[PDB]
Amino acid sequence: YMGWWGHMGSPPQKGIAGYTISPFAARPFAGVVHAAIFNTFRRTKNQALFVILPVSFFYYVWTQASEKNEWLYTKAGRHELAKAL
Amino acid sequence: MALRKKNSLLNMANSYVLDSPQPSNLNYFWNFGSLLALCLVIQLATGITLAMHYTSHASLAFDSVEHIMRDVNFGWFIRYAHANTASFFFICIYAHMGRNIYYGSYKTPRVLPWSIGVIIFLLLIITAFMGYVLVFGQMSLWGATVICNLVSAIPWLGEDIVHFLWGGFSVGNPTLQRFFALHYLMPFVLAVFALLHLIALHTAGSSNPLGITSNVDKLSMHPYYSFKDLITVFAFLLMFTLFVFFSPDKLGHPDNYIPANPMVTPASIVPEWYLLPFYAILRAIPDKLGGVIAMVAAILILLILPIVDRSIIRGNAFKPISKLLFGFFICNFLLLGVLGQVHIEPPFIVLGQICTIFYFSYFLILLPMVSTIENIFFYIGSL
Amino acid sequence: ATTFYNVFVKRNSAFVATILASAFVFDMTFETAIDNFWDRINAGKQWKDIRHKY
Amino acid sequence: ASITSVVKTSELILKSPLLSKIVVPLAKTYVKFSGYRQLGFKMNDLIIEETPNMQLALRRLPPTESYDRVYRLIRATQFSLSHKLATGNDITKPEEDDHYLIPYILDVEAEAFEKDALDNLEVV
Amino acid sequence: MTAAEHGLHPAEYPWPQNGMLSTFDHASLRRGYQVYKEVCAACHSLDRIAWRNLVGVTHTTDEAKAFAEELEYDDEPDDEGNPRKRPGKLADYIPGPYPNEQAARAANQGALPPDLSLIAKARHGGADYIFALLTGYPDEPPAGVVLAPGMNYNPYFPGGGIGMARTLFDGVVEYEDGTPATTSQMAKDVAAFLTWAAEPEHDERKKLGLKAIIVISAMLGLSVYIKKFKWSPIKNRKFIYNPP
Amino acid sequence: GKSTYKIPDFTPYLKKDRNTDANRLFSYFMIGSFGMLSAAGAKATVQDFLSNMSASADV
Amino acid sequence: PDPAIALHEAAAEGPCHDFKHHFDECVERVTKAQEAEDYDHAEYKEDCVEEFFHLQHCINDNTADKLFRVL
Amino acid sequence: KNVIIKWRGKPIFIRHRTSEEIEEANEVNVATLRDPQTDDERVQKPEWLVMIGVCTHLGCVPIGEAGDFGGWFCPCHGSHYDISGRIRRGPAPLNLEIPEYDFADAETLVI
């Protein structure tokens, strides 16, 4: 499923013209400030829910479990601990 | 014809590191492969060096590690580099496996590099487990004991096998000397399998974040990915530096600075952090043999991803529901990790069982269902 | 700039020689600089600072 | 899963009035959130092609369709590596998201599945 | 587990060595050695430390040779093969109070005082735990605590009952540098000394780390420039498509 | 859009002084500095690391 | 004398007064309970470790930095 | 009291059981026991519980007097052994093994 240079296995290409300029002719950091602020904000905004939802849910689960565990091993939690075991 | 192409030896290097045709759009998650190669090289260099100063005999082992720390020039560095790189090796391998699962790298035509990969992961676990025993501190001894008794769960011959792996009736000098020899060997085996999974990959080439063919648009591996790999090499070395020089013991257990004592069992025996999720899965099943099966199955189940993923599309970039499911799967794997190091107490017992069920149901139920539904949504949605 | 390029950069043999000579100088000067800086931020704490009492 | 499967199941849903009433709006939002149109792709551009069946279907595409697909893949790869999205006419409009490949793959698969059946025929 | 079973967690004290760029205070190290020598060494060994280790850290070559030369070590047998003793040398290890575990336990109501060479690394808390433990014996155990025989109440110790009694009291040591030897001062000094004993490369390690951080950061910056420079023809690529 | 002789707009990226020796020299300064720190870092690494093989303090 | 003595006393009477009173009340209850007969044949014997920990944790938070500043 | 004698690297728990301890052990119906055994099968002398003090689950040493059956509790995975050293609760499948021991004298046993 992959060939090599000259016969990579692409369907025939026709009609595309590609253009680029030399690394020495270009400013490598052109538009860096705009990218760093606006591009990163857009990319992050669009992915935020996919991180926030699972992280927040599992953090809540952990928080509840660890708080209960702490409470069960206090004096106040004696009776509830006795039942739990 | 250029020498790099003409000469058969040079041509093999050329095909992997120079002329190798890569997708032009690999993102930074494609950099863990080279980080894993870096960890392997650091572990070989530091490991062989430690072997020049370490004594595998149980009467001298712990002391030989102290001699390395205290007397050998830069021995402290070589020791801490070796110990911390073992952790970084697992961070990079989990990232690499995470990348592979998210982007569907396990799908045809890359089932074989993925399946060899699963074996590499098992070899890393065994390598790291045996290396940890070599210190012969309290965590070393008891770690060996407990893990080498998982073989007792095997019916009939199980106990005989345990004594065979110990070279006696308990973990002792025979076990330590054999773990040294095997710890030395295993990284070479691991390097061979790492080479095999690359050769297997070379038939399809790298996948890419869009999940489409890159045959239309290829970039040479050098100089583009060479120089892109340097960025993460230096980011890695920064992380390495902060641990090795400023916090060398953050990832370790203080009890491993106590010499092994077969009588006293330490208050809490937990594995190294990177094994913690598998230990939580084992605790979840009350039965001995049940627990062992579950724990091994948790790794071997990765081999069925090619089958249970029913999607007509490779990878999760364009699959919102699959992305949510993947997020929950990863966070559950981290919760299992955390539960691996809590005390066996309420309510963590039941929580560990729920997280274990979720772990397996990802492979067996959710991914097959979600991938089926998304297929239908793509078709109806674009009509 | 032309002159500098022509002398130190154009020939790779010269470029590599310049890089290695610079690395040698950097190594020696950076050593000395860090030593002094480390001694100033950790002043009165090191053995060299109390040695004179003994 | 085979394209045939996906197409048949979809047709069962589209038939049922109740089912279509609840599934079609969900599928349209799924597609909106999927965001492949924002890289100038058509849905069919995303289908896994590294299989004998799909290689055969792609070889049977009309040359013009084939040339256009090559361009959309190259263009999307350039957006990907630049971390940009399509703008203006590069965005795939819903009316441009045509199933150009589905007919070809359904024919390739039809034959492949008939061949499997007939390889197992039993003279009665 | 109950908090008692865990032990109270020690405060985070501002040690001189806390801080990416901070060494130990060597004057504190020297004072801490004096506390070890005069108080702890009665029950605790420091087996991993040789006299040479003190030299250029806490003591001059002459002071350390003087410490070594006051002791007797086993020599090689004489010509009739009879045992002999010799005076100590810088290569010798600091000798412990007891010949074996059995003798150690007999002297300490069954408890075995650990060797202190690695104790700062072998306990969660490190110096803070050592300082907290030594200074954290309450005059009276909290009402309701039943101590086992030979045990002393200390909340920092897991379970609360430790076989080691309080040993630091104001003025048990007379420091040679004129520092007032209060319980707190002595605990701070000895905790520092023991931390040094566990990790004697500490000072050199952190200085080399500073050098590494600087070089590696610069290399990371330059690697980002070079990557962007090399990749710009690919990033900047433009297409015109004319459908055939 | 159609004519392939109308080069796409590269003005946001083109440097005016692209053909000058000063322009090249700058980029070689960056490459050279990187090579220099890599050389100094390798030398430090090799020297410190190999020193483990010299007689240890106890010897 | 030991600077810690004064600093600890000051912190107990001041910022950690609620916890001081809790510990005190606990001690009173437990001593009284031990005074009562057939205490030795009781199922549950209350201690004051919990309250003690809360007090000590508090004192340490208000003192640690001050103490090391005067050594 | 319970002693800990090293024997082939394994710990040996030797408990000098009181009368009432023996009684407590002889109560549990053999029927409800993962590993069904009575104390009489375990000890050859009711006053000398001699066991291999390694937990039958994975191989840690149980902390004695602790438990829920007030014999031995393995801290590793929370398995509870009895005054006979029988498993009552937790992952451990078997009762704490008994070594081959003989009373040469009434004051000394060999293992």
Ligand code: HEC
């Ligand atoms: C005369 C006896 C004696 C003196 C003096 C003594 N110790 Fe100890 N120490 C012990 C005993 C016994 C233990 C073991 C306690 C136990 O495990 O219950 C111990 C335990 C310790 C522990 C470890 C507690 C743990 O977490 O296991 C540290 C640290 C310690 N001692 C440090 C010191 C320092 C520092 C000094 C004096 C400056 C000191 N000791 C003086 C007898 C002594």
Ligand code: HEM
């Ligand atoms: C020593 C450990 C390993 C090393 C050094 C290693 C190295 C590499 C390298 C260099 C690549 C190509 C570049 C990249 O995609 O990052 C790669 C690709 C891959 N590796 Fe690994 N690998 C290791 C372990 C694993 C493991 C544990 C798995 C799977 C469980 C795995 C599965 C793969 C797959 C499927 C690919 C192809 C991904 C793609 O490009 O789409 N590898 N590996």
Ligand code: HEM
């Ligand atoms: C994949 C490669 C490797 C991994 C993941 C690995 C992992 C480990 C780990 C986790 C330890 C315990 C470290 C500690 O806490 O002190 C260790 C110790 C050790 N390893 Fe390795 N190792 C690897 C390769 C090697 C190799 C090739 C050697 C060659 C002999 C080696 C020799 C040693 C020695 C001698 C020790 C004991 C001294 C010590 O603890 O530092 N290792 N290894």
Ligand SMILES: CCCCCCCCCCCCO[C@@H]1O[C@H](CO)[C@@H](O[C@H]2O[C@H](CO)[C@@H](O)[C@H](O)[C@H]2O)[C@H](O)[C@H]1O
């Ligand atoms: C990764 C470190 C670098 C060392 C190289 C790794 C060692 C593994 C190499 C041996 C495995 C055989 O590797 C195999 O070699 C040949 C030629 O070399 C490659 O062949 C490829 O390149 C050559 C020219 O470059 C073409 O003739 C051929 O059409 C193409 O497929 C294979 O795609 C590769 O799979």
Ligand SMILES: CCCCCCCCCCC1=C(C)C(=O)C(OC)=C(OC)C1=O
């Ligand atoms: C397919 C499984 C690969 C081998 C996994 C072995 C390493 C993790 C095993 C778990 C473990 C178990 C079971 C365990 O019980 C234990 O607790 C005492 C640990 O600490 C020594 C462990 O590490």
Ligand code: FES
């Ligand atoms: S090891 Fe004894 S309970 Fe698991």
